[PDB]
């Protein structure tokens, strides 16, 4: 079972309303475990899953210290970029940052990431080799030269390949029951007459973890990709996920159609058929 650790950082300027908004959230695979909100009263990194609540005050005091340092860099960054693009001080702008690491089924480093966007577009990203940078424009090229001269990539590499994966492993061990579990999908199908010569067949997958899943319809064993309505995998609210797939079936043809479900929590892919 491959795993990842990821932090997502959102910074938004609020012209004439004071300091910019800053949200930090941390995830292990598809489970959120911490948060920081600039507008909340605690002004601290806060637990968002029971298993991390067992870390003591040194852990929390340290994460709070580092999350405040991130916020402060993002506060200076909004003004730097604004100057780089010669932008007015009246418009609201958006900065986003994402970093983390993935490990494979052996729990060993597979890849590390550090990406950065300005107003929803790629601004600067660390390449896969963890030594070079991908700059989206001249403003970005200016950030690149700065980060190159301060040896930022080398510092990131030591974090993503070392510390990042070490703490991922610690987290996987500590939140074993939550994070090392798989919840196979609970499946069912519904049939709803739409008219008198056709009907909607819906295939459901519920209460599954993790979120990755393949849910497809076939007619005589042939893919119906183009003829399927497929919703985006959505969160149930309790740590599990849901998804459905539907097709409009001509009268008397229910038996030509099969619903296919692939998921980590299933020992063998399921083949369902209304009958």
């Amino acid at each position: 079972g491959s795993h990842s650790m990821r932090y997502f950082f959102t910074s938004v300027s609020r012209p004439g309303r004071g300091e910019p908004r800053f949200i930090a959230v941390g995830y292990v695979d598809d489970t959120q475990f911490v948060r920081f909100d600039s507008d909340a009263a605690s002004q601290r990194m806060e637990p968002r899953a029971p298993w991390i609540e067992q870390e003591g005050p040194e852990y929390w005091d340290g994460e709070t210290r580092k999350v405040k340092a991130h916020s402060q860099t993002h506060r200076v960054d909004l003004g730097t970029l604004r100057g780089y693009y010669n932008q007015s001080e009246a418009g609201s702008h958006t900065v986003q940052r994402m970093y983390g690491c993935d490990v494979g089924s052996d729990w060993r480093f597979l890849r590390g990431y550090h990406q950065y966007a300005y107003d929803g577009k790629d601004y600067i990203a660390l390449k896969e080799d963890l030594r070079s940078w991908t700059a989206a424009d001249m403003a970005a090229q200016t950030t690149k030269h700065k980060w190159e001269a301060a040896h930022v990539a080398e510092q990131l590499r030591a974090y993503l390949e070392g510390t990042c994966v070490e703490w991922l492993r610690r987290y996987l061990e500590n939140g074993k029951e939550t994070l090392q579990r798989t919840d196979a999908p609970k499946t069912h199908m519904t049939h709803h007459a739409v008219s008198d010569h056709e009907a909607t067949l819906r295939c459901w997958a519920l209460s599954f973890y993790p979120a990755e899943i393949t849910l497809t319809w076939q007619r005589d064993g042939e893919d119906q990709t183009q003829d399927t309505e497929l919703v985006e995998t959505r969160p149930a609210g309790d740590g599990t996920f849901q998804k459905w797939a539907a097709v409009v079936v001509p009268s008397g043809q229910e038996q030509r159609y099969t619903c296919h479900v692939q998921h980590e929590g299933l020992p063998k892919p399921l083949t369902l058929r209304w009958e």
């Binding site: 860099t73 200076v76 730097t80 601004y123 990131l156």
Partner: peptide
């Protein structure tokens, strides 16, 4: 476990 330090753009 957050990284540190964090350099400006």
């Amino acid at each position: 476990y957050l990284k540190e330090p964090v350099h400006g753009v």
